[model samples]
Target: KHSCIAVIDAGSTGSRLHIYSYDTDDTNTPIHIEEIWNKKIKPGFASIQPNSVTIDAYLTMLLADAPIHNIPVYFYATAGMRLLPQSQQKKYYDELEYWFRQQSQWQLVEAKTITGNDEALFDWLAVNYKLDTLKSSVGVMDMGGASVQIVFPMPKNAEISKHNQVELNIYGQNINLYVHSFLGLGQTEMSHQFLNSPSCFANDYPLPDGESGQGNAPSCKEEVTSLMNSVHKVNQQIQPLLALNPVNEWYSIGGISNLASSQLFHFENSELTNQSLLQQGDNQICHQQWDILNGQYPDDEYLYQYCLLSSYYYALMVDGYGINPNQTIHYIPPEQNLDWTIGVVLHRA
Candidate 1:
């Protein structure tokens, strides 16, 4: 026999529902999770105001098919709600509650905004669960459209001043984790923060539509690298215990690594696997992007953002994550992509 749970994870820009039916024997070593169904939508719950589209089409679907009131259903919002103003967020929550009551079909145990640290821990657990590395050393680094979550097991009193650290009993062992979430570091929002005048572009390059470049790669990289470095000021202290075996989420959004904004730079078959390190001058990126928009590559809907996306991710991994350019960052493996919803089920079980 198997158990079932339906989960709703609302993010800054999107929301996804996953129904998992799984079973675990005494050992719990092979707790296989079977995904029953999954559906997604954009303009997340946090982004919507009461007056604007108060109707929950997604919620309606949740109740339409299965006997939702019979099973367990959970809704958790991520950094999206955290960014909203207190009063407004409360109003949204109240509206959701009101709607839930009116529907009378959802047996919602609890629908609330989750903490960033909780997200970090769940992501770490989920990735490890999929890779079957609960006993091994597996680190986690995930960046969404609005924030980044990183978790790694460490020892107590590690001398790290910053970050949301926690001590928890996971599986059969007690472990310490260094978890932190950096807001406003997501690729999309970060680009909007410095769009009009991007210093990363070539200094002498011409800007279309009366735009301007602050300087060449030097000027832009300095700022981005600083931003990335600021997020992990305590990385060196915390990472000493990490074995550096973990999965990433960059490829999900179509960007090179963990960014939704720069998704268009991906070429069909060859480019994704071999997006090697940049060779010499950064000016070459301009030509590559030009070829992308000119139909030489797959630009997708985000062709215009190639410049911003690549620069942001490059800086994020190299300077923010504190790694060398030549190092390979695996966002999603070819076989399967681990998700937090599965981890949630494991936690509940």
Candidate 2:
């Protein structure tokens, strides 16, 4: 059987594998890509404590249907592996490599692992590619399963005048950029915050209602409202920092960004309703759902369009990462072709 390149994203909550057929042609406008098989593994406290046995079991199960006879597979670790101690992490990697080789006669090549900065850049690229912003400086907010990254482009990339001319640092490129990573800001953290923080529930400045006065916990609806209000507050607090250079654009990335866009229309007096483009003169708040989802827009081609633009720009930032953009392929899975993909996923999960 023929061999292909496999990209594994071992995230906080789960692990995913993206298989891509290699194309060396320079003139090819679009390369071919297909999801041969995808399986989501329940990543235990593996984020903090590496589990070789668990990882091996997950990979073995995922590839059970597709036999790897004399084929080559590439493995890359992400946040989970990075957090593990050096000895344990390397031991895990060695074991994984050995297992693949022993079971299927597959040559498992260790792929380049992504760092916290690289993850930040991925979200940044997604946001930058999707949103239509007038300001050169924009804030890219990504809420991932395990971590949240807030990236603010430097002065050169921060304004309307320099939008076309600005150059962003790519994942591979080690450029001086302003990026912040919050260790605990995922769904779990948000949920916990909603439950415990009075400021999150009341929405009032300084939280006029004390936690002691509230009997029992708030309903899910109340929690959700509090969560949104908290997010808005976080946005407000970060606004000044984002506005340091007078950024007129707020580009929201990650699952939350998609959720906000879907719910925006449902909110009363939301300016986003009935308008293809939402803007307040030069200042704008745009959602780049596609980029956030890594080119898989939950719904609406608009999401994909914005994602494409951001990814392209990010590709430029990274100088193509030896992956030729002209030779790259664009593939959309059938299941993702819908308007409610993002919202449905959020609601179901």
Candidate 3:
């Protein structure tokens, strides 16, 4: 018989519900997981008011029409919830718990704000599960709207913070990983700092400030590099860990996939190199006149920021993570929308 489970990813911009059916192995680990139902609600959980009436309405919209019920549900909020203070987060969870208690069909196993470290572990696990590479040494990077998580295999070290590392025994094998998250380094959060920088935008693009864009990828990258290196110390923290424990194969999820697949950029086989991305963004989006480009790709809402985003990604991946600019980084197709929730069911089982 298949066991049913539900996982909700309370993200920065929205909440997504995923219900999966799976069979357990001899060790009671979830296997052969298949998603049965999936849905997403907008404005995010943390973004809404945390009163009972509002929370009830939101929960109903999320759960009312599920095809299956009476299964365990895990409501794990990510970076958005992390942004809230514990006092504030408590209000949302309290109201959420009250609503779940009023319901009989959905079994609320746990609902809480998860740490970025825990989120990173799940990211690595979920991707490896999908790629069938859990047995090998592979790295996973999940760049969300509010935070970015990087995790790769490394032996347990007393030197590293306990919070930054995770060890798991699954599928009758042991896995050790080093995981870290930069809270404000995500594309959305990080972009706020560079919004008025002239070099970060397309030529003739109107900046929120008085200045117009003077698109230059190299200059843009240098500006972003200051934030990553001086403020976040991403390079200082991550470079050494990667140096000691190198991972040749890399997989990325989230915004990078969207950016890479955009019409403005050309990537072969769903893979990208930082060097190529910088050059493409520099030549195509950054150097082009904003009005002409906007007219050409009216549906591309993210077009205006491609120049900055391209520079930011390069700065983060190469300058921060210390990955080679020429290194091929694989991204899951945007259509797949694979996330960390699947790992929740696998681990919870």
Candidate 4:
């Protein structure tokens, strides 16, 4: 069996593992982090209660296929655990450590709730690495359930929040990033905030839902607009991002960067995106409003509460980010995802 390094990404929504077989060539010509495989099974660890009995067994099964006993594991917890109260936080993550400790596949394992910048580091590395090319000054946008992050180039003379700058030396190339995470602005957290707004939802739209209800669409849009503007603390986020002229993050593995009105956010490469558009389907659950307002995809696989999620996506990008509808958001093709786990895999390799 080959040596393995398992990067366990324990995010707010679920947990995933990226197992890489470690190898290196003569004279550092190449280091092998050939991604043997990856897997996921979860409602995140953050969702489990301290005394819950199921988590231990759940984790044991997830790691059963590591292919070796000496792999070092790093369980990087994202936002969900970061939001837990101190008392609950200890109970939740400590238990994760307890279960991971019992497993012999791990030569070493560390489970801890990671901070915003830590999230930023993995994202910055992964997004760029996914491209398989060296394109400097690329901007990054990573949105999850509990928080959204922006990572872009930072110049020394630029007047900006100094607290979030990260200096990274990747392959002897010095890069600086102005990284900041906007909390309470994630898809789920934003919906919770809007759950009580009357104009934002239709009466029969499940109280918090919007599609089934028919009211003042204009009024609803305005309310969502006001909420986004009020909660957006940094004017610099909207400002610098535009100036950076960021690409959809298709900037590499999929393509390159700058700014635009519309582009895919995550994708496999337009290489196959249009192949199936053989027929127009509800391919974009997050974008495209017709399917959203009409309740087209009730049993949609990925987005459970499409109604609010769609509305928030519109309000956040169009209104909050000041983007145009014609823009292409960063997107990956079917079954392909954009995650920092693999980025870390390469970095570690």
Error of 4 at 20 (Å): 1.9
List model 1 lDDT by residue over 1-349, tens digit each: 5677778898877778777777765645326778877777777877665542454665664446653345677888888888887887778777677776765556676788877777887777777776667655456766666777767665666556445777765556676777776777766666665555446543333456466443334455556666666544534433343434332322221234422223333333322322242221244443344433336445454544445555666666555555446544545432354677766776665
Top candidate by TM-score: 3
Top model number, lDDT: 3
lDDT (Cα, tens digit) per residue for candidate 4, span 245-332? 5544322122111101113223333422221211111233212443453475454343333334445555555566665544545543
| Residue 324 error, candidate 4, Å | 5.5
Span of ten consecutive residues with least summed lDDT in model 1: 245-254
**How well does candidate 1 score on lDDT at residue 292?**
34
94: Cα error in model 3, Å: 0.9
> Lowest-scoring 10 consecutive residues by lDDT in candidate 2?
340-349
- Model 4 weakest 10-residue run by lDDT: 252-261
Q: Ten residues in a row with the worst lDDT in model 3?
A: 128-137
lDDT over C-alpha atoms for residue 246 of model 3: 90
Model 3 RMSD vs true structure = 1.0
TM-scores of the candidates are 0.78, 0.49, 0.98, 0.74
Off by over 4 Å in 3: none
What would the TM-score be for candidate 4 when compared with the true structure?
0.74
